[PDB]
Amino acid sequence: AKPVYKRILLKLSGEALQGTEGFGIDASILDRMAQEIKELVELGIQVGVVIGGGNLFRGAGLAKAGMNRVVGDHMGMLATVMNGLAMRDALHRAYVNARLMSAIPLNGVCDSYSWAEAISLLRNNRVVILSAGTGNPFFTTDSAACLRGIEIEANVVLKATKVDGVFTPTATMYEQLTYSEVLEKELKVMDLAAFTLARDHKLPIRVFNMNKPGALRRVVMGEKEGTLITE
Amino acid sequence: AKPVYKRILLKLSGEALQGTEGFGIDASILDRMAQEIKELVELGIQVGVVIGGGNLFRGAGLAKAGMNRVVGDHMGMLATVMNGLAMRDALHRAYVNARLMSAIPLNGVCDSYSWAEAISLLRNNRVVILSAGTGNPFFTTDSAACLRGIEIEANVVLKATKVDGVFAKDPTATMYEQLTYSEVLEKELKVMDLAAFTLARDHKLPIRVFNMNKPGALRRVVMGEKEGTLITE
Amino acid sequence: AKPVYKRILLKLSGEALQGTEGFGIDASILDRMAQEIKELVELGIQVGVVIGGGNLFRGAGLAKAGMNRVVGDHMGMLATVMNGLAMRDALHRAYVNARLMSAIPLNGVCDSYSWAEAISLLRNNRVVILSAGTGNPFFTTDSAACLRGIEIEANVVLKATKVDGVFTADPAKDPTATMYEQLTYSEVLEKELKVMDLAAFTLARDHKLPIRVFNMNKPGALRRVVMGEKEGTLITE
Amino acid sequence: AKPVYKRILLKLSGEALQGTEGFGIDASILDRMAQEIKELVELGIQVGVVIGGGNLFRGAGLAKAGMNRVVGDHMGMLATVMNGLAMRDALHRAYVNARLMSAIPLNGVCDSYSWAEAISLLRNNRVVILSAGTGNPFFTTDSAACLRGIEIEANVVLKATKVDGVFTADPADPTATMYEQLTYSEVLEKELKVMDLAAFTLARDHKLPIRVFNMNKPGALRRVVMGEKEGTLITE
Amino acid sequence: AKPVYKRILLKLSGEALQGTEGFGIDASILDRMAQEIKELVELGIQVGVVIGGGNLFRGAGLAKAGMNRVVGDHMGMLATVMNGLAMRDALHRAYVNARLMSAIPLNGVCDSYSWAEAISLLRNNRVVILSAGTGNPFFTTDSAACLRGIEIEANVVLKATKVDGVFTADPAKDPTATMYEQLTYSEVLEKELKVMDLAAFTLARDHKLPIRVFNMNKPGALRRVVMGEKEGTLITE
Amino acid sequence: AKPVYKRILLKLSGEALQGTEGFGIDASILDRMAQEIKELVELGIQVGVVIGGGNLFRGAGLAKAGMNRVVGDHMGMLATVMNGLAMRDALHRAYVNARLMSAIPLNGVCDSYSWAEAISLLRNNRVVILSAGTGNPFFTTDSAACLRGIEIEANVVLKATKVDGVFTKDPTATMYEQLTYSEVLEKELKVMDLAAFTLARDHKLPIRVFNMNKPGALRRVVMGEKEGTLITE
Ligand SMILES: Nc1nc2c(ncn2[C@@H]2O[C@H](COP(=O)(O)OP(=O)(O)OP(=O)(O)O)[C@@H](O)[C@H]2O)c(=O)[nH]1
Ligand SMILES: Nc1nc2c(ncn2[C@@H]2O[C@H](COP(=O)(O)OP(=O)(O)OP(=O)(O)O)[C@@H](O)[C@H]2O)c(=O)[nH]1
Ligand SMILES: Nc1nc2c(ncn2[C@@H]2O[C@H](COP(=O)(O)OP(=O)(O)OP(=O)(O)O)[C@@H](O)[C@H]2O)c(=O)[nH]1
Ligand SMILES: Nc1nc2c(ncn2[C@@H]2O[C@H](COP(=O)(O)OP(=O)(O)OP(=O)(O)O)[C@@H](O)[C@H]2O)c(=O)[nH]1
Ligand SMILES: Nc1nc2c(ncn2[C@@H]2O[C@H](COP(=O)(O)OP(=O)(O)OP(=O)(O)O)[C@@H](O)[C@H]2O)c(=O)[nH]1
Ligand SMILES: Nc1nc2c(ncn2[C@@H]2O[C@H](COP(=O)(O)OP(=O)(O)OP(=O)(O)O)[C@@H](O)[C@H]2O)c(=O)[nH]1
């Protein structure tokens, strides 16, 4: 089997790592995800991963209590590094070479993000996990995925979601769209600022379903899974 | 009254900020804690706080799955910074001046720990929250509390726990009122991690174990009044 | 009068500091700008400034030659710090207290950005210059201005431009072009008006950060924008 | 032929990258410089480059207006990093492996200078570009080239200039002639303008050979390396 | 023979590098030590070294004069980096690949400690010297050796000392004195034996990190400790 | 009296802190030096100090053994920070406000050098100790003193030496009283490293060479009185 992508940026939601309790990190659901990535690696795909922090930091309640927006996003930012930290470990236990990089330098914990060092690592069959989003508050994990995606010169961003693509009860799942077509039809693919970044840099986005078994493997094979977004 | 301590290091367990769900940060339980600290500040006490990360990172399950011990502690270390981040915010919302410092520099998020800058801040009626423990793995939050306690030249470390001192599971027990470092090792009592305890002992840093859940217990511990156990020599 | 803003984020284009030669930094055009800011400070306004790097780095030619986009923006990012560096100096020579902060820490050159430290400095009658944009490539100086603006809790972002606000059409080329006085984020997207980069605009919209586009070349226009008087366009909702 | 140098430190003036407009970076003048370096690399030479910032920051006018000297030099320092940034990119587009290092750490932009990491990189056929001078103000780009040159244990510093070596008299004074070799003592004695005195002292005290040559003279660089007689050499 | 250890953490006292004058660094005593390590490297052992700073900073006199304890330990911390700096150099002169890492980042001098980068380097036949202890004051070099030892996943910590192991009672002031050969963490606390600082010891115990106390002065003792042969005391459980 | 200098950069040799044993740091010789500086502070002088590392690192022997020159200078660089560390402490024990800055950032130990932050500190009656020289190898402590001197806009660099100024080991020798940069190069006099000297010359930074051992000599150099040699133009 051959893949239509040599280098991808896989974007996970923090919740993707949640267990039944609807929070934290579930070891098995995580090792499962490590294996899915091990496949992509073995198919010769260079994999950058960007994780969110929703499973470790909600903070909707703290926002309600009046918590400063910036401080809130800094907490989420750290949350994403815990997830990345866990994922890098999960991969090493799956005998996959992996590095964790952080937008916010964390001395002794993981190396600081460098677009160049990331490319170098990906070219050496290292999975590169990219943490702490953009380094700034008020930017979604999507924004970070696209920014990183563009920097590391990925062929595509794979937004792993709970839904099986972009949908028009009835109607139908789109199969392909354009950046213009998505704005025009007012479809919810991702945060508008993140979307603009991908559009302006002609970075293809594939929305798919991480829960649909082997869906990831298929998205890479080029096969029709979820929606693709290009132009 | 008059506080018998001009500078204390209050050590909280991460769980201290947990809600009913037994995880995360509960806004009300947190703002409550900010208020308790606002009191100590208003009494003219200089307050350093050291928080753990247990409420945000358990990772006993990940350890079970074979997660590297170092990576595990690094996750907890970050966890403690989220708690500190939350607490600093909670205090500013209670109109208390507060700084967050981290053993691991976090550019743009909070300033890097400096024993000197910490003292300077405490002397300016800033509550100083100390995050990311010692900066190293394999050191308990207790160890960090003592280390920081000694560095900032605190008069005492207040270990806030769920129990009312050193002794509701056996009808045959009695709360100590004061002990010595030697007396605690000898009687094999569980005050805190042994490495942490040694650090306090060797630097003659008094430890007060008390009950954060017992209302006003904190206020009392400071007044000098008899609350929980004291440990000196 | 009385300024309707206690804290503003003034966003300058790098070119704003250009001389006649259309590049670099012109000492007099810079000292003038320092004076304009000295006024706002004296009126008791807390001033954050965000500068671009267009006057020091073009690099359209290098992009044409195939230069990597990231590297290009990093060069621009450094460019903005040179401008900030020059501006902080110009202000100290105008006896205005000023700090330079950078999104990319520059040991010994200026302090690293911290939203908190920025607020603290503004509250102490320091002009805070914010350099190196967002710290990332592919983000405009506008994006940086809004992001910083929201972080330091500014009341408004003042986009200083060469035009006197937002026009129904273009003024410099069309005699039917007239000037809006106020718009809404929705109204700007709907009427497809060019206020600023879309990503930057979304940031301001989602955080209800008012934007005032005005003309830095129109003498005293800055002073007026602050007085609340009608200068250029305002954008709120 | 065979290069008489295994490791050199090439020192460029920022202006070396200027276009016709007398400022900025000209893509073509830069890509040709990348190609000149690609040659040295494929001759098996280890190349460290030190660039100035004159093309991106003049600031004589701002000095005149009273700008603080330190701030001025910090601006130039950043300027050199922009040049280095451009040069590293130019080399990668010429399929030459290259790293940018900065005396002032720049998180995420390029790695921090380390004399040791520099040598390691040079030994792996990486061109190592060294930016932000010495990290300090009041030190010329020449000073940085010598300092770096000594640190990375280069065999020679190649000061690329607009003139074809050191002349008995001012070239652009029709009665001038070109030296072929001098000594540090001979240069101070004859009061010749090779480079800033502080920089020169550094090279002298560490017996670091300096070759002044003409970057505009085609293939002059290739020749300086071959050992052939181009511009002036300075040793002892 | 065959080394019973694939990765060790060798802990030296700063004094280990002292000359006759009882201070500083003696080139020959250092090059000697570099050679001992070159052996371990050639036997295929991955070697992490942790050095103290006692030879370069005493400061008992400054403590006496009232010097702040923290400041004192920071001076010692820097001291250890000077030793590590010297040792890395000594090894390169012995044609041994070696990296210096510091708990306190030292831009341009050596790279910052990273448990992961340390392991990577050891796996590439680099000797990894670990400096500045734990990065904190009030922690002994022993504590640093154990912490590092655990982090880099060493099989054993080799505490090189002036004595030939752990003794029941002093061997030169008692004829019935028999140097232990093996102990347990519990056995050492129980018998109240001085192996190392209590905090450091607890760290090794809780992580089941074997400790071998031996004599660096006894020629070839190091080589033997590694061979598995019975030199000095071992401490496990 | 009235000091003819509002801001000075005092350059000490590391050896200046040596005891009888000819190495290390002698507590009393150090506290003595702290007091001399306390005076200058009390006279309203802003004091920047630059210390060398000779007392803590010789390394002529290690150079002889083939040690890399860079590594050697890095060791000395660290040495200077130990001295500065000791001096900052000595000053706080003499109730003098003092900050330590390093050309090489040392997280948690002391703050990173910033020419601006240095000036700010000096203007707030802080003695500012400047460590790790220029941050680079192959630069003398003199070079660092001048560079720092120029950056912090000092009026003068006071090179404290063992000799009482610049002299014409001789029966026939007279102490100069004032020279010029040109006059010093011309007469081939040993004031300081040539690179360092050039820096001071090109920036018209006055240098006063004097004798730290001559009691009250420092106090006098500041009063404007004739002590050791002055070098200007
Ligand atoms: N169990 C575990 N080991 C780790 C982890 N991170 C680093 N290591 C160990 O440290 C070694 C070096 O890790 P890296 O920083 O990734 O360096 P590397 O040479 O690129 O090794 P790989 O990236 O794993 O291929 C790894 O091979 C592991 O032995 C982790 O997250 N979990
Ligand atoms: N809501 C909120 N605001 C913060 C927080 N941290 C900093 N700030 C804001 O940023 C300003 C600067 O904060 P600091 O860096 O702590 O400096 P400061 O002058 O000591 O401010 P205080 O600690 O309140 O005295 C504060 O006055 C607040 O307005 C936080 O955690 N939550
Ligand atoms: N000429 C000039 N001097 C500067 C500049 N930056 C700092 N300084 C010097 O540094 C002193 C204070 O440094 P700052 O970084 O501004 O810190 P500060 O404590 O806020 O001092 P001020 O902002 O000037 O009130 C000033 O008095 C200047 O002498 C600059 O950009 N240009
Ligand atoms: N276009 C461009 N690409 C760069 C630049 N710097 C790094 N890269 C890319 O990032 C990858 C990693 O390069 P580096 O991290 O700088 O170092 P490296 O391991 O020596 O990689 P190479 O130099 O390409 O062999 C390179 O292969 C380039 O594709 C640059 O300045 N311009
Ligand atoms: N004399 C001396 N040279 C050094 C020292 N450290 C680094 N170097 C030089 O810098 C080169 C690179 O050393 P490293 O930074 O350790 O990189 P490396 O690839 O691990 O090189 P090795 O350690 O020799 O394997 C060495 O080959 C030496 O030439 C040192 O401490 N002393
Ligand atoms: N013993 C000792 N204490 C120090 C030293 N440095 C800082 N401290 C303590 O930490 C406090 C803060 O020091 P700084 O960082 O210099 O802050 P500061 O506001 O400038 O305070 P001072 O300089 O001491 O007036 C001091 O008041 C001392 O009590 C030192 O070198 N030795």
d(CA D13, CA D56): 11
Cα C44 to ligand 2 centroid, rounded to whole Å: 21
Spatial distance between the Cα atoms of B19 and B72, rounded to a whole number of angstroms = 23
Amino acid (one-letter) located at B216:
G
As a whole number of angstroms, the distance between CA E188 and CA E183 comes to: 7
Q: Are A145 and A50 in contact (CB under 8 A)?
A: yes
User: What is the spatial distance between Cα B135 and Cα D156, in angstroms, rounded to a whole number?
Assistant: 44
Give resolution in angstroms.
2.8
Distance CA B143, CA B154 (A): 14
- H-run or E-run covering E157: strand E156-161
Q: In whole angstroms, give the CA distance from residue E164 to residue E214.
A: 5
Residues F209/F163, Cβ–Cβ less than 8 Å: yes
Measuring CA to CA, which residue among C54, C49, C50, C52 is closest to residue C22? C54
Residues 6+ apart with CB under 8 A from E179: E164, E165, E166, E167, E168, E171, E232, E233
Residues whose CB is less than 8 angstroms from the CB of residue D192 and which lie 6 or more positions away in sequence, other chains included: D166, D179, D182
Non-local (6+) Cβ contacts of D20 within 8 A are D26
Which residue in F41, F55, F75, F42 sits closest to F12, CA to CA?
A: F55
For helices B69-92 and A69-92, the axis angle rounded to 10 degrees is 170
- Three-state DSSP class for residue B185: helix
Find residue C62's DSSP bridge partners: none
Contact (CB, 8 A) for E4 and E227: yes
Instruction: Determine phi and psi for E29, rounding to 5 degrees.
Output: -70, -20
Q: Which amino acid is present at A52?
A: G
Residues F11, F191: contact at Cβ < 8 Å? no
Distance CA E69, CA E71 (A): 6
Q: Token digits for F186?
A: 């011309």
Q: Output the six-digit token pair for D167.
A: 């002349």
Chain F residues in contact with D147 (beta carbon < 8 A): 136-138
Residue length of chain B: 233
Within 13 Å and on the Cβ side, how many CA atoms surround F186?
Answer: 5
Which H or E element spans position D9? strand D7-12
Say if residues B228 and B217 touch (Cβ distance below 8 Å): yes
Q: What is the DSSP letter of C9?
A: E
In whole angstroms, give the CA distance from residue B139 to residue B142.
8
| Residue D125 amino acid letter | N
Residue F51's contacts (CB-CB under 8 Å, 6 or more residues apart) are F11, F12, F13, F14, F16, F17, F80, F83, F84, F87, F129, F131, F141
Residue labelled with tokens 């560079």:
F147
Provide the strand spans (E) within E18-107: 46-51, 98-102
∠ CA B140-B146-B148, rounded to 5°:
100
Q: In what order do the strands lie in the sheet with A7-12?
A: A111-112, A98-102, A127-131, A46-51, A7-12, A156-161, A205-209, A227-229, A176-177
Bridge-based pairing state of the strands B229-231 and B207-211: antiparallel
Chain C interface, mutation test: which of B85, B89, B107, most C Cβ atoms within 10 Å? B107
Tokens, residue B203:
């630097």
Tokens encoding A22: 């609807």
End-to-end Cα, chain E, rounded Å = 26
E33 three-class SS:
helix
CB pairs under 8 A between C and D: 108
Q: What is the DSSP letter of B141?
A: H
Question: Considering Cα of C60, then C63, then C67, then C68, what sign does the dihedral take?
Answer: positive
Q: Which domain holds residue C150?
A: 1-237
Residue C51 in contact with residue C12, Cβ under 8 Å? Answer: yes
**Cα–Cα distance measured from residue D165 to residue D211, given in angstroms and rounded to the nearest whole number:** 8
- How far is residue C196's CA from residue C213's CA, in Å, rounded to a whole number? 9
> Which of the other chains make 3 or more beta carbon contacts under 8 angstroms with chain B?
A, C, E, F
Residue A21 CB contacts under 8 Å (≥ 6 apart), including other chains: none
Test A78 with B77 for CB contact under 8 angstroms: no
Give the integer Cα–Cα distance in Å for F128 and F102: 10
- Number of H-type helices and E-type strands within chain F: 8, 9
Best CA proximity match to C81, nearest among D81, D58, D100, D66: D81
Index of the ligand 1 atom closest to the CA of residue B67:
1
* SS3 state of residue F101: strand
Separation of alpha carbons C172 and E170, rounded Å:
97
Length of chain F: 233
Pick from C75, C111, B107, E107: nearest CA to D103? E107
What is the number of residues in chain D?
236
Q: Which of A114, A134, A153 to mutate to test the interface with D (most CBs of D within 10 A)?
A: A114
Residue with tokens 């160890």: B143
Distance CA A29, CA A17 (A): 6
Q: How far apart are CA E220 and CA E160, in angstroms?
A: 12
- Reported as half-sphere exposure (CB side, CA atoms, 13 A), residue B36 has a value of 23
Amino acid at F122: L
- Whether residue B72 lies within 8 A of chain E, CB to CB, comes out as no
The whole-angstrom separation of Cα E235 and Cα E190 is 13
Residue D93 burial (10 A CB sphere; 0-12, 13-18, 19+): middle
Task: Say if residue F134 carries a ligand binding annotation.
Answer: yes
Tell me the sheet residues that pair with C159.
Answer: C11, C213
- 3-state helix, strand, coil split of chain B in percent (to 5) is 40, 20, 45
The Cα–Cα gap between C150 and A138 comes to 9
**Alpha-carbon span F143 to F173, nearest angstrom:** 28
Look at residues F116, F128, F119, F156 and name the one whose alpha carbon lies nearest to residue F41.
F128
Strand, coil or helix: F94: coil
- Specify the ligand 6 atom closest to the Cα of F93: 1
Distance from C-alpha of C142 to C-alpha of C237, rounded to nearest angstrom:
19
CB A42 within 8 A of CB A2: no
Instruction: Say yes or no: A109 contacts chain B, CB-CB below 8 A.
Output: yes
For C75: left if phi > 0, alpha if psi spans -120 to 50, otherwise beta; the answer is: alpha
Closest CA to D55 of D96, D94, D12: D12
Ligand 5 atom at shortest distance from the alpha carbon of E96: 24
CATH code for the domain of B32: 3.40.1160.10
DSSP B113: P
Chain breaks after residues in chain A, where C lies over 2.5 Å from next N: 168
Tokens 């003695």 sit on residue: F127
Report the alpha-carbon distance of residue A13 to residue A55 in Å, rounded.
8
If one counts the domains in chain A, the total is 1
Residue among D28, D65, D107 minimizing CB distance to C104? D107
B28·A65 Cβ contact <8 A:
yes
Distance CA D59, CA C26 (A): 9
Query: How far, in Å, CA of E57 to CA of E52, rounded?
Result: 10
Burial tier of A114 (Cβ tally within 10 Å: 0-12, 13-18, 19+) = middle
* Short-list D111, D83, D96, CA closest to D35: D96
F90 is in an annotated binding site: yes
SS3 at position D159: strand
End-to-end alpha carbon distance in chain C: 26
Cα distance between the two ends of chain A: 26
Tell me if E233 is assigned to a ligand binding site.
Answer: no
Buried b (16+ CB within 10 A) or exposed e, C136-168: bbbbbbbbbbbbbbbbbbbbbbbbbbebbbbbe
Given a contact cutoff of 8 angstroms between Cβ atoms, the answer to whether F199 and F151 are in contact is: no
The dihedral sign for the CA sequence F87, F88, F94, F96? positive
- CA atoms of F179 and F229, how far apart (whole Å): 7
Tokens 């400054």 correspond to what residue?
E62
Bridge partners, C127 (sequence order): C98
Q: Is C185 helix (H, G, I), strand (E, B) or coil?
A: helix
Is the CB of F142 inside 8 Å of chain D's CB atoms?
no
To the question of whether residue C140 is assigned a binding role by annotation, the answer is yes
Using CA positions, which residue lies closest to atom 1 of ligand 1?
A: B68
Q: Is A218 left (phi over 0), alpha (psi -120 to 50) or beta?
A: alpha
Task: List CB contacts of C41: < 8 A, sequence separation 6 or more.
Answer: C47, C96, C125, C127
Q: Look up residue C17 and give its DSSP letter.
A: G
DSSP assignment string, chain A: ---S-SEEEEEE-GGGG--TTSSS--HHHHHHHHHHHHHHHHTT-EEEEEE--TTT---HHHHHTT--HHHHHHHHHHHHHHHHHHHHHHHHTTT--EEEEESS-BTTTBEEP-HHHHHHHHHTT-EEEEESTTSSSS--HHHHHHHHHHHTT-SEEEEEESSSS-B---S-B-SEE-HHHHHHTT--SS-HHHHHHHHHTT--EEEEETTSTTHHHHHHHT---SEEE--
Whether the CB-CB separation of E26 and E90 falls below 8 Å is answered with no
Sequence-distant (6+) residues with CB within 8 A of A33 are: A12, A16, A17, A87, A90, A210
Q: Give the Cα-Cα-Cα angle C80, C81, C82 (nearest 5 degrees).
A: 90
Asked if residues F136 and D134 have their Cβ atoms less than 8 Å apart, the reply is yes
Give the β-pairing of C156-161 and C98-102.
Answer: unpaired
First-to-last C-alpha distance (Å) of chain D: 26
**Residues of E with Cβ-Cβ distance to B195 under 8 angstroms:** 198-199, 202-203
For residue F113, what is the DSSP state? Answer: P
